[PDB]
Amino acid sequence: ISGSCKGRCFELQEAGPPDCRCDNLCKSYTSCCHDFDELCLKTARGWECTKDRCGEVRNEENACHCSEDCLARGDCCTNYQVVCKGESHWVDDDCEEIKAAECPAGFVRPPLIIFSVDGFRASYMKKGSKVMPNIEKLRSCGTHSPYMRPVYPTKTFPNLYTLATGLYPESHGIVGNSMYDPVFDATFHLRGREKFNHRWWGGQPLWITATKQGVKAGTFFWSVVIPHERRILTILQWLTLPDHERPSVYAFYSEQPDFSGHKYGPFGPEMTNPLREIDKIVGQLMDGLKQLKLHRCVNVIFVGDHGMEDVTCDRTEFLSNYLTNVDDITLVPGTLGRIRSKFSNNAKYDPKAIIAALTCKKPDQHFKPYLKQHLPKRLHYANNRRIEDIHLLVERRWHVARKPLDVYKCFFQGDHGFDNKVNSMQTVFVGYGSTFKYKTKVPPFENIELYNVMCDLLGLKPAPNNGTHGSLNHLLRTNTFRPTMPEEVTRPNYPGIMYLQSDFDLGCTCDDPKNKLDELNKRLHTKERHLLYGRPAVLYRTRYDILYHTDFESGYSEIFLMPLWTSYTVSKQAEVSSVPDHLTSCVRPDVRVSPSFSQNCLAYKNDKQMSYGFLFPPYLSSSPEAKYDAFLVTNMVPMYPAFKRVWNYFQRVLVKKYASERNGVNVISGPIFDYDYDGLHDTEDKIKQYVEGSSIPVPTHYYSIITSCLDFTQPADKCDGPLSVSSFILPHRPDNEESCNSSEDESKWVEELMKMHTARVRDIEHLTSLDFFRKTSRSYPEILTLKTYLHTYE
Ligand SMILES: *[C@@H]1O[C@H](CO)[C@@H](O[C@@H]2O[C@H](CO)[C@@H](O[C@@H]3O[C@H](CO)[C@@H](O)[C@H](O)[C@@H]3O)[C@H](O)[C@H]2NC(C)=O)[C@H](O)[C@H]1NC(C)=O
Ligand SMILES: CC(C)CCC[C@@H](C)[C@H]1CC[C@H]2[C@@H]3[C@H](O)C=C4C[C@@H](O)CC[C@]4(C)[C@H]3CC[C@]12C
Ligand SMILES: CCCCCn1cc(-c2cc(=O)c3c(O)cc(O)cc3o2)c2ccccc21
Ligand SMILES: [Ca+2]
Ligand SMILES: [Zn+2]
Ligand SMILES: [Zn+2]
């Protein structure tokens, strides 16, 4: 029927204007029918049955019913079985393991109910079951992690869509709660109707994926006027539909505890009550599922999108305090900063001048300017036209605004959007049901990994996303997906001594009784190692060679004229030698690689802006005889003199620090070329910078994977079990403007710079098209979880 909303409340089909919309989103489109409020939003007698209502005469106007007829219809209050038939609340029951789904007849698969909460700080869980009995049971009974890492910017819409797609915001297009698209020439906003236009949303969210493969979805979204209790009743009724009509995946959104978090702050004593009200709803969902004989059938995912941090109006940096004129720019303010020109026809707008006027211009400055391609690669926040070039990384607890006149109501005590590695931004994840594990705790993970898990829970083939499928298989009791290691594309060459030193005119010079001392060591004793996890696989068509040495091993690339990876192991008792002055400028030819596929020294001498470093540091040679291997022309990579300060301190000081701390470490280092900042390995054509007068490409970044045993009582090269990893993708910049303490000694800023650019092993793999940890004796799902690990230092 059209013009009326009878027999249609929260329907799962559509026709359009003029026929009414009776679904749960008609209120948002301002196009419900006239009887919607009295037919679909009934609210008489509340949401809980009482004892006198047990067996009532079914009065149609009630919100939920307590008659004996209601369970056949499926519209009872969630506590019917409790206050009438003597059943107990789902929380009051003991934890019974679900070794197999106990679904009623007609259920061809366990349904998935996603319970999302806005701004649910990860630390909110430590309030205990005195405040959140239902949620705490799910957490302790099912599968949970200490926290879950959101995506930058840690805002509502980018994360909620990242949850639905498994994509970074730069890939699915929702790069913020409000954004400007220069192609559309329109402005996306949280409030308004512009967000309903499909042109803003990329990728393939879960409900579209389920529908495209035959799995019925049902609307994930709810207009804010529909109370939470009615949303649960609607989800519980949908499960009572016939088999050919019942959807398999459901969703429930809650604006809490983010609503009250903005008003009172995260650690305010008022925060306890909104959590209690949330647990009431989770209890209503569980009691209603147990009432429907589905508590041992469904899978429930209790998930948040971001955390919460203390912010105040008194803590606001203003661009008017740094820029001589702020009336010619547009700023996206708040917990993050994006700057674009207010007028396109303006040549007086200089992006160079704006970055300089904001870079280390005042002590205790609570923001850092960035060209978007220079942000930490772990953020994956650049490859999109809606992301402005100038980006401001705002310190936790602080805000950035354009001028004091723009701020007004303090209209807040908490906010979010900061760097997603900040503690306050971490959120929660709880997996409970017949497919999640029982009383099992998993290590923290990123929310881009959930879309593959939800597709596996529904038997769907996931759309291409940025999760590493298989790295969360340890969340499930049984796994239908079984990951495959990528096959090698380019087999390596193992060249021997093919040329003579006379065949080389690279322009390199190097000089030539420690040997008798080394032999007196070796001879007078009473009693491979550098590639502990199998050589990396090259996942693209190229030409490269495996070069063995005493102290290190490298996959030298004849196309890029430098190694793709350099592997060496540093013992706990490894000594750090120096380099004599007559070997400081020494570079030796490698008689295993053709002179035509070798770097030349003359190119570095002509490029006044460019120097060169080494992938294996000569400072860590086992002997002066072996030190000559480190000076091979196949071991040098081009580095700016400013970056050499960062590289030298890392190799000469920090690798020895890590080995002494972690019972030896295995280092795998190499270059990264990402000139179009899309997070993927660039081919030769995209490289936009070379060494002057040569074909030696200049890397945009340099990486290093530091691996050791998790059981530190064993060395790095005799590790019987799990592995501990930590990696970084350092930007190869010609200046150290990113570090305001760069004038001081390296021990006062370099380590801080490296913690900022930490990265998962998976991040390096996308940027290098290599595959690591291939021969380790760990199950491949375990290795995938190791590659997704991000050492966050908090
Ligand atoms: C995160 O995941 C997404 C999707 O898996 C990745 O984006 C994908 O990037 C590839 C290559 O950049 C795109 O494929 C291209 O398709 C065109 C035809 O449309 C073709 O001409 C090209 O040669 C290439 O094959 C793909 O469309 C694109 N998909 C989406 C949804 O954006 C992205 O690279 C991943 N990011 C990271 C950091 O891993
Ligand atoms: C209470 C309101 C503020 C909630 C706002 C709902 C809005 C974010 C939802 C409503 C309908 C959604 C779109 C619809 O499901 C169709 C798809 C196709 C898919 O390929 C990409 C996503 C997209 C466009 C959905 C985007 C988000 C929407 C607008
Ligand atoms: C598979 C992962 C589950 C999450 C799916 N998911 C729910 C969204 C939602 C629904 C609301 O009910 C809602 C509201 O009532 C007020 C409000 O301000 C925003 C709101 O957003 C949403 C938005 C963008 C991308 C994805 C999304
Ligand atoms: Ca790239
Ligand atoms: Zn949110
Ligand atoms: Zn918020």
Curated annotation (Swiss-Prot):
EC numbers: 3.1.4.39, 3.1.4.4
Matches recorded under SUPFAM superfamilies: Alkaline phosphatase-like, His-Me finger endonucleases, Somatomedin B domain
Impact upon substituting S116E: Reduces lysophospholipase activity by about 70%
Active-site annotation: T156
Subcellular location: Secreted
Cystine connections: C5-C22, C9-C40, C20-C33, C26-C32, C49-C66, C54-C84, C64-C77, C70-C76, C95-C141, C103-C297, C313-C410, C360-C740, C508-C601, C510-C586, C709-C719
UniProt-reported outcome of changing F157Y: Reduces lysophospholipase activity by about 70%
Cofactor: Zn(2+); Ca(2+)
Residue ranges of the region described as Phosphodiesterase: 91-443
Induction info: Up-regulated in massively obese subjects with glucose intolerance, and during adipogenesis.
Chain sites annotated for binding 1-hexadecanoyl-sn-glycero-3-phosphate: T156, N177, D258, H416
Chain spans, region Required for secretion: 764-785
Residues bearing carbohydrate: A357, N466, N741
Catalytic activity: a 1-O-alkyl-sn-glycero-3-phosphoethanolamine + H2O = a 1-O-alkyl-sn-glycero-3-phosphate + ethanolamine + H(+); a 1-acyl-sn-glycero-3-phosphoethanolamine + H2O = a 1-acyl-sn-glycero-3-phosphate + ethanolamine + H(+); 1-(9Z-octadecenoyl)-sn-glycero-3-phosphoethanolamine + H2O = 1-(9Z-octadecenoyl)-sn-glycero-3-phosphate + ethanolamine + H(+); a 1-O-alkyl-sn-glycero-3-phosphocholine + H2O = a 1-O-alkyl-sn-glycero-3-phosphate + choline + H(+)
Posttranslational mods: N-glycosylation, but not furin-cleavage, plays a critical role on secretion and on lysoPLD activity. The interdomain disulfide bond between Cys-360 and Cys-740 is essential for catalytic activity.
Domain SMB: 1-44, 45-89
Keywords linked to the UniProt accession: Calcium, Chemotaxis, Cleavage on pair of basic residues, Disulfide bond, Glycoprotein, Hydrolase, Lipid degradation, Lipid metabolism, Metal-binding, Obesity, Repeat, Secreted, Signal, Zinc
Outcome after substituting T156A: Loss of lysophospholipase activity and ability to hydrolyze sphingosylphosphorylcholine
Keyword rRNA processing (UniProt): no
Binding residues annotated for Zn(2+) 2, in chain numbering: D258, H262, H416
Primary site of residence: secreted
Biophysicochemical property: pH dependence: Optimum pH is 9.0 (isoform 1), 8.0 (isoform 3). Isoform 1 is less sensitive to pH. Isoform 1, isoform 2 and isoform 3 all retain some activity at pH 9.5.
Role noted for this protein: Secreted lysophospholipase D that hydrolyzes lysophospholipids to produce the signaling molecule lysophosphatidic acid (LPA) in extracellular fluids. Its major substrate is lysophosphatidylcholine. Can also act on sphingosylphosphorylcholine producing sphingosine-1-phosphate, a modulator of cell motility. Can hydrolyze, in vitro, bis-pNPP, to some extent pNP-TMP, and barely ATP. Involved in several motility-related processes such as angiogenesis and neurite outgrowth. Acts as an angiogenic factor by stimulating migration of smooth muscle cells and microtubule formation.
Domain notes: The nuclease-like domain is most probably catalytically inactive as residues that are essential for catalysis in the DNA/RNA non-specific endonucleases are not conserved. However, it is required for the stability of the protein and the catalytic activity born by the Phosphodiesterase domain.
Family to which the UniProt record says this protein belongs: Belongs to the nucleotide pyrophosphatase/phosphodiesterase family.
Protein name: Autotaxin
Top-level taxonomy: Eukaryota, Metazoa, Chordata, Craniata, Vertebrata
